[PDB]
Design an enzyme around this catalytic site. Sequence first.
Site, PDB file in Angstrom:
ATOM      1  N   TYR I  23       0.776  -1.189   0.080  1.00  0.00           N
ATOM      2  CA  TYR I  23      -0.089   0.072  -0.010  1.00  0.00           C
ATOM      3  C   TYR I  23       0.967   1.316  -0.025  1.00  0.00           C
ATOM      4  CZ  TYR I  23      -3.058  -3.767   1.875  1.00  0.00           C
ATOM      5  OH  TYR I  23      -3.772  -4.955   2.309  1.00  0.00           O
ATOM      6  N   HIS I 100      -9.627   1.648  -3.308  1.00  0.00           N
ATOM      7  CA  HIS I 100      -8.782   0.841  -2.935  1.00  0.00           C
ATOM      8  C   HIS I 100      -7.134   1.060  -3.271  1.00  0.00           C
ATOM      9  CE1 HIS I 100     -11.692  -1.849  -0.980  1.00  0.00           C
ATOM     10  NE2 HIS I 100     -12.441  -1.624  -2.065  1.00  0.00           N
TER      11      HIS I 100
HETATM   12  O1  LIG Z   1      -6.832  -0.154   0.295  1.00  0.00           O
HETATM   13  C1  LIG Z   1      -6.735  -1.225   0.048  1.00  0.00           C
HETATM   14  O2  LIG Z   1      -6.460  -1.494  -1.334  1.00  0.00           O
HETATM   15  C2  LIG Z   1      -7.071  -2.065   0.902  1.00  0.00           C
HETATM   16  C3  LIG Z   1      -7.722  -3.554   0.781  1.00  0.00           C
HETATM   17  C4  LIG Z   1      -7.956  -4.435   1.694  1.00  0.00           C
HETATM   18  O3  LIG Z   1      -8.483  -5.468   1.305  1.00  0.00           O
HETATM   19  C5  LIG Z   1      -7.450  -4.232   2.885  1.00  0.00           C
HETATM   20  O4  LIG Z   1      -7.646  -5.103   3.816  1.00  0.00           O
HETATM   21  C6  LIG Z   1      -6.875  -2.908   3.238  1.00  0.00           C
HETATM   22  O5  LIG Z   1      -6.310  -2.639   4.673  1.00  0.00           O
HETATM   23  C7  LIG Z   1      -5.019  -2.886   5.181  1.00  0.00           C
HETATM   24  C8  LIG Z   1      -4.856  -4.201   5.416  1.00  0.00           C
HETATM   25  C9  LIG Z   1      -3.220  -4.531   6.191  1.00  0.00           C
HETATM   26  C10 LIG Z   1      -2.445  -3.393   6.326  1.00  0.00           C
HETATM   27  C11 LIG Z   1      -2.691  -1.945   5.997  1.00  0.00           C
HETATM   28  N1  LIG Z   1      -1.875  -1.107   6.187  1.00  0.00           N
HETATM   29  O6  LIG Z   1      -0.639  -1.605   6.796  1.00  0.00           O
HETATM   30  O7  LIG Z   1      -1.901   0.180   5.435  1.00  0.00           O
HETATM   31  C12 LIG Z   1      -4.113  -1.821   5.257  1.00  0.00           C
HETATM   32  C13 LIG Z   1      -6.619  -2.056   2.581  1.00  0.00           C
END
Ligand SMILES: O=C(O)c1cc(O)c(O)c(Oc2cccc([N+](=O)[O-])c2)c1
Lengths: 142, 142, 142, 142, 142, 142, 142, 142, 142, 142, 142, 142
Positions: I23, I100
């Site tokens: 991300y 997303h």
């Molecule tokens: O924005 C997205 O594409 C997104 C999609 C997902 O299915 C997530 O669980 C999701 O959330 C998370 C999950 C685990 C860790 C983090 N993070 O360390 O920014 C963010 C983000």
Amino acid sequence: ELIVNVINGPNLGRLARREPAVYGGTTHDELVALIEREAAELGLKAVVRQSDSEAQLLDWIHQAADAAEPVILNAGGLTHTSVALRDACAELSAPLIEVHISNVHAREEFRRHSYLSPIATGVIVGLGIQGYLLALRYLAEH
Amino acid sequence: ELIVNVINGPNLGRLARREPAVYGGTTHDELVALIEREAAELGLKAVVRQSDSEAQLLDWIHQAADAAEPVILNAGGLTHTSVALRDACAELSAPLIEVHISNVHAREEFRRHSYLSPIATGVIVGLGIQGYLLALRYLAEH
Amino acid sequence: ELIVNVINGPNLGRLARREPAVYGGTTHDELVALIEREAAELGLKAVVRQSDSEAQLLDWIHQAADAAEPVILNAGGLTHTSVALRDACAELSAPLIEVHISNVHAREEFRRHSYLSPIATGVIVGLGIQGYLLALRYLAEH
Amino acid sequence: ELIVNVINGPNLGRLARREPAVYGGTTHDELVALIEREAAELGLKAVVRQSDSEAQLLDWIHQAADAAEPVILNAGGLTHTSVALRDACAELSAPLIEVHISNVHAREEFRRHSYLSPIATGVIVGLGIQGYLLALRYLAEH
Amino acid sequence: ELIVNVINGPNLGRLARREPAVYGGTTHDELVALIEREAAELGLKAVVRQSDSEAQLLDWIHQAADAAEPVILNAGGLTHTSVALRDACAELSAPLIEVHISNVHAREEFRRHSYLSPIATGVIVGLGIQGYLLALRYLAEH
Amino acid sequence: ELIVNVINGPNLGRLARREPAVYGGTTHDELVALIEREAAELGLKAVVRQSDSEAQLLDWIHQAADAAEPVILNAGGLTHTSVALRDACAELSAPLIEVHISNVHAREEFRRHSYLSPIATGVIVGLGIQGYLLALRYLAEH
Amino acid sequence: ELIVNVINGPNLGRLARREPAVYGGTTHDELVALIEREAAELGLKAVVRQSDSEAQLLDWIHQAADAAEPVILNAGGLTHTSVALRDACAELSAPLIEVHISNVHAREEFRRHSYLSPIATGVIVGLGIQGYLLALRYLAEH
Amino acid sequence: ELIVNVINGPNLGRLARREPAVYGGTTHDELVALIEREAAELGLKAVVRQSDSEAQLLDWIHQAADAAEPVILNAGGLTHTSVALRDACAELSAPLIEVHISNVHAREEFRRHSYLSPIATGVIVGLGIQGYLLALRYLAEH
Amino acid sequence: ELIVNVINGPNLGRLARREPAVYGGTTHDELVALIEREAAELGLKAVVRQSDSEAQLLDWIHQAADAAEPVILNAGGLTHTSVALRDACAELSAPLIEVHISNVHAREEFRRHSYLSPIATGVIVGLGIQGYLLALRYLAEH
Amino acid sequence: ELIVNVINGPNLGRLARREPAVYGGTTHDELVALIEREAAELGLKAVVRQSDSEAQLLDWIHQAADAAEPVILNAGGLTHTSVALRDACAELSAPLIEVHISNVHAREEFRRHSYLSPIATGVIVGLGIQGYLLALRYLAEH
Amino acid sequence: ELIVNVINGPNLGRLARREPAVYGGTTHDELVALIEREAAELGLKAVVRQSDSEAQLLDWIHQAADAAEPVILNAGGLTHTSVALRDACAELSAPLIEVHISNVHAREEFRRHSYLSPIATGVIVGLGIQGYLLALRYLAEH
Amino acid sequence: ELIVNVINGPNLGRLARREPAVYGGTTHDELVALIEREAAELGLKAVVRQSDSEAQLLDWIHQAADAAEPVILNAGGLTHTSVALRDACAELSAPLIEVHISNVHAREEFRRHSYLSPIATGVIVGLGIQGYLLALRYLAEH
Ligand SMILES: O=C(O)c1cc(O)c(O)c(Oc2cccc([N+](=O)[O-])c2)c1
Ligand SMILES: O=C(O)c1cc(O)c(O)c(Oc2cccc([N+](=O)[O-])c2)c1
Ligand SMILES: O=C(O)c1cc(O)c(O)c(Oc2cccc([N+](=O)[O-])c2)c1
Ligand SMILES: O=C(O)c1cc(O)c(O)c(Oc2cccc([N+](=O)[O-])c2)c1
Ligand SMILES: O=C(O)c1cc(O)c(O)c(Oc2cccc([N+](=O)[O-])c2)c1
Ligand SMILES: O=C(O)c1cc(O)c(O)c(Oc2cccc([N+](=O)[O-])c2)c1
Ligand SMILES: O=C(O)c1cc(O)c(O)c(Oc2cccc([N+](=O)[O-])c2)c1
Ligand SMILES: O=C(O)c1cc(O)c(O)c(Oc2cccc([N+](=O)[O-])c2)c1
Ligand SMILES: O=C(O)c1cc(O)c(O)c(Oc2cccc([N+](=O)[O-])c2)c1
Ligand SMILES: O=C(O)c1cc(O)c(O)c(Oc2cccc([N+](=O)[O-])c2)c1
Ligand SMILES: O=C(O)c1cc(O)c(O)c(Oc2cccc([N+](=O)[O-])c2)c1
Ligand SMILES: O=C(O)c1cc(O)c(O)c(Oc2cccc([N+](=O)[O-])c2)c1
Ligand SMILES: [Cl-]
Ligand SMILES: [Cl-]
Ligand SMILES: [Cl-]
Ligand SMILES: [Cl-]
Ligand SMILES: [Cl-]
Ligand SMILES: [Cl-]
């Protein structure tokens, strides 16, 4: 090791005093005592927490990821339902062991899918309260 | 307890000398030594057998059912495929623990269904060779 | 007729002495006696064999195909799992009757699919040990 | 025993005079004669009825439940389709045997599911008209 | 209101005198008395009919559609199986309430799909015989 | 009876002032008034609570299990999604009635599966706000 | 190359003398002659073995893995059913070619899934006995 | 030709006077007039019958099979649900055309499966009342 | 416009400082700065909030529905799991854009279903942090 | 033989110069040279064509059907997607061999279904460019 | 009417001269003659075109949408596979009739799904070449 | 950047002049003007092409792969249906953005699967014509 995060999810504060056919006659506090004593002899610290809130659990995982400390997780119902949990765990650098007190595979067909397993180190189901203790002992070796 | 039947299925004679990324650098004989030594201190006898034959494995289960002695089972591929095995186990009066060396849930989607689990006492996956040792220790309590 | 091959698969050597809620209080040997006596009055020979090995069973089918002699098959777990069996049977020139001692349709949803049925002459389930005897009597007419 | 209810569902009045590749060259009346004669020697009474109406069949089951008399059922198409039938049968105190003249498992994939089987005592498929006769003989023992 | 059509399908003439674990100890006639008395105090007329025939039930629906009078329907097995029923109901101008005496959702997985629900006003399951009475009272308000 | 726990889940604080095509023109507070007045005449106490938090709802169920007091549950979205809820309810000694204001069966195919139903006493859907009132009245009899 | 392991599974000892519509008029021994002669001209050795036993086949794979020698596999029914086989093959360092004598894709829908393919080098189906010979020739290049 | 059996199933007596958005403003009797007049000019006899009973419809098919006379079938809901119907039709020596007044493929996903089609000569859907007339005209050629 | 609600769900407080393969290397606060600056030039106000609690997120949606202000939603795991969220969004009068950061369609097959999309205005996936900025700019036009 | 039609579908003009991890370092023209030289020694003519158009490919099949000349087909993506292709091939009187350069069974689960296989003579996958050459050689025998 | 667009897709130029078991002994040109003569007597113009290209067919649909002229479509394989076609048709203001020469419902299970039907006026299958003629005649009335 | 390939598939030449409820009142040429003007200010060149032919589109992708220039793709129906397209795109070294004018997720369940997404950089759906413009602007940053 030394520091081992033990986490229970929803409903798991009700251990022993309610049920006990299915998840056993041992209360939560008694479980903390059990874990704390087994960590003593093992030379580990057991930080054992329980919550009925997903955001709380999330926070505890976040902290464990940060501190790079291992987790033992009995996430109750969130095991089969939460992707938010799974993904927080996914981040953990340290091993995560998934623990189920009851055998999940001998119940409703839905209880057999787990969002946690695929990203766990390994899993223990149906060995009852001892699942926690056997999980601990694993971590003390690795 | 005292007597604890430890059973490995197909391919599990190849431990360590082949793989070892996936199921670890520990050979079969070394595993028998590990189990036998852990049963020593626990005050149990470990009768640890391996076979690549379903009829052989079947026979060993039959005998365990008869002797009402507990089993620890790593049935390899037969875990996902054999109903004959499952049903022989179903008969066991004593506890049966299902053991997987690798985490089954972090592989091919097919490796995630088990004919054994529903009628096991409980299951250990992905804790490696130690799964056997933690299973033993369970049985020594119950 | 005269010669009628009766074949049992995995676990079916354990009849009566183990179970008997599910597949009945009648031992294997007693079953051979039952079949042999019913074949007497019918003017047939019953060659009744049991094995926990797929290769053994395979061989007996091969021989029956060759001798063009009918088969009655209780293949245990291999009923739901083996394509090797199904295909050996497929070859039989003589009728094949599929026999189940317990009602398969009143159990786990998986026990309801059969690789054998589609290429059987017909099937008997849940009529207990008598399923064999009724199967025999069929063959004596056709 | 003495009294044995034999029931055929939809289309089964057309036996022999129509088909006969699939369900055989034997007419309905001839079947009643066959059953009645086999019940004679067995020392049973066969009350053999056929109907193309679900309400009629229902009524006959109701009566059999009441009289606690056994049933042999060839429900034709209603086997795969009717929950109303299944549930009326479910009530029967006496054994119910499900009979199919043709092998259901060697046809359209849809003909392989049965609402009746799970609550039957047992089932006979593909042994042709004799299925009825073998079913009778069962009941005379139990 | 005033006129309220109460309809039971297949097997529902057997209430109380048969079962009564599952659908309760109350006979059909007693149910008509219950409904008729509750409609009295409510100032409604309850025309309560039962049939084991789909064509009969169909006809009663047709008439209710015509008279634009509300329906309460316990269609038994036809709930899960009949599209003919569903479509006759679909026509009703007045509200239709779907009633189940037993909780459908705590039984066989097949009993959980309903052709009637999607075009019902609403549904009551598992509240037993009272489901009818609560349904009535609804209609008296709307 | 006397004490009847009425529980609404996520979004259900928005009743009337938002929607009202789908779940009706009646506000939450007005609903509490409706329930409280109907419990008056019935000689019951209605403790009616709403929350958008799973942990809150969980807690209220826990308390109801403890006090062995009945529940009426409109869990909103958690109906289709939460196993944690289902399992907390599963514990309740007293009857639980599941209530839906809109007909669930006439919407998205996903809204048709419920984790709550299988362990409810019974369910009411689509009878609108009155579903609560009819549920109450049930409990006052049983 | 030089050494090429050719392996047939269950039933494949029956080639030609039985069938031959489906898998051809060529007997097993004749097939060994065919392969051995084609390996001659190619300058390879063909070690061609057949067994109706999974443990035997397993052993031959084990040996091939060890000797790092290529395999050509016609595993019969075990192709669609055995995970034990698949996983033994998975170990092979040398290429594995999967061979089917009949076109699998023009038969029962179940014959179309293969546990072997995903970890094979490549597959030949329906080219009959020649599939073996074309497979050989591949290996002689690579 | 000359004699052409036209058959409507459940609910189809309600044509025009009820609906008419979906199946059109033409009443049943008017449809008989339409068909009878089109058969006139074609030099055919149209025996056009309707019933809400499966046993009645069954009987009419039986008779058509016997008389080897063609059928045009609008079986209403039984199209998607009855195997008894399908199998009675299967017997017909003469062509059977399946007719739907509404386009089945532009409605509920369930209305898209037909037990009749696979054994029909051909099918007409959504061309409204004219579907019958176009079906007739077909038969007059073949 | 002017006022634009930007909402992140569970785990999204961990941006940059944790991950950043998946991300991106941009922290949460930095993201607020990015959005706030882009809204500046656009002449919009960005109210950008994040929470790991479903009830919190719910509340923010409620408020946005009330104020009829647009939303940009990155709901993390709740995207695939929460019907409560979906339904709160469903209420929004203003446009909702689903965002997303990672491409959902290039991951686990489960991450490909979204409860939010069907009722969103539109969706952006995999364009990283910029997805938010492109979403903003959309809203400034419409 | 003599004349052998070799056909490649969409994208297959890009061989070698693009990829070459997956479908190999051999360009299209080089492949034509390879095939043409192997047909030389075999005493066959290879007419080897490639197109990214379904109508073109269709036409070439049409011509091959007409001339009753064999085909070797690598239809690229159309293998999994086109029924138009499948049906044109279905017509071919001469053998058709289906060829895949990469192992289809070791990729995306969707790449594992083929519209071509069921009506092919046989198939070769994953043997790389040599698949064509081995296919040729087959045809030269049959 | 007057102007009626008749369109055939892939392979349909091969009518009669190839097949003719399945789609009949009538050539394409002969079909144009048949249609043109039937349109004569009806007082319509039949513009009958065939193509093996999706873009061509697309174009003809585009033109028909524009000219608001009706279509009769036999799209061959594209019926089961193309969403591009379906959506071009979706645009047509005039009626579209879907025509199949063979009964689609009596073949491979895949041939039973159609992208065209849901947005057609109605469909004709299995009435052979006459399907076109009956379709025409429909349009002449409406 | 500078050079940005913008590609539309089947039917997308019909923009504005046909529809415009669903994909908007903006014609194709007007869209080219929109894109070309936005690329001006961005300092990019937009080469914007449309075709109703898969081979044409294929060719344009081939060229973009070669020139290593980015693509924006609205492939119309081929999005859900073509593996040939997907695989040509898969080759592109430069980013590919998938664009849908309508929200795909708020339509037929089939429109929700995409062969393109898994190998896209990211996707935009339902933001209308602006999706193209927002996609452009992305590329200008990366
Ligand atoms: O924005 C997205 O594409 C997104 C999609 C997902 O299915 C997530 O669980 C999701 O959330 C998370 C999950 C685990 C860790 C983090 N993070 O360390 O920014 C963010 C983000
Ligand atoms: O550890 C487990 O095996 C377990 C598995 C589950 O699926 C639970 O929901 C679960 O949580 C519950 C659910 C209901 C009640 C209790 N409890 O009274 O301890 C605990 C526990
Ligand atoms: O214990 C397990 O986790 C396990 C699980 C499986 O699904 C196996 O097939 C399995 O067996 C194999 C398969 C291939 C090779 C070996 N081995 O070289 O130890 C062992 C083991
Ligand atoms: O004949 C049957 O109905 C039957 C069906 C099955 O699915 C079996 O696994 C099966 O085999 C078993 C399995 C476990 C134990 C025994 N036994 O102690 O006789 C027999 C028998
Ligand atoms: O007894 C059976 O094996 C049987 C099974 C079925 O699925 C039938 O529909 C069925 O009923 C039919 C159907 C069509 C025709 C006849 N008949 O001419 O005897 C009987 C019979
Ligand atoms: O009202 C219900 O909950 C109900 C549901 C069902 O699925 C029935 O088949 C059903 O009908 C039956 C079935 C068998 C026996 C009786 N009865 O003896 O009242 C009634 C009733
Ligand atoms: O009681 C029901 O029938 C019901 C069913 C559902 O699936 C809900 O999500 C649900 O909750 C909602 C969802 C959105 C908005 C509101 N509301 O504005 O009252 C309530 C209620
Ligand atoms: O090589 C194949 O194409 C093949 C495929 C299969 O699925 C078999 O079961 C199979 O094995 C059989 C099965 C039954 C009989 C014989 N045989 O008489 O050679 C061989 C062979
Ligand atoms: O001919 C059809 O297209 C048709 C298809 C169906 O699925 C019906 O249930 C069906 O039957 C009905 C159902 C409800 C009402 C009427 N009617 O008022 O004519 C007819 C007809
Ligand atoms: O022969 C095969 O194994 C094969 C299988 C496929 O599913 C293809 O899409 C396929 O076509 C492609 C697709 C993308 C690129 C190339 N190419 O650069 O040679 C060829 C080939
Ligand atoms: O009109 C039909 O019923 C039909 C249905 C299909 O699924 C076809 O592929 C189809 O197209 C073909 C396919 C192969 C050959 C021919 N032809 O030689 O006329 C036509 C026609
Ligand atoms: O960009 C989209 O969101 C889109 C998605 C689709 O699934 C299409 O078939 C599609 O193509 C069509 C289909 C029919 C008509 C038109 N058009 O008149 O612009 C365009 C476009
Ligand atoms: Cl597990
Ligand atoms: Cl059966
Ligand atoms: Cl319900
Ligand atoms: Cl293959
Ligand atoms: Cl159709
Ligand atoms: Cl998307």
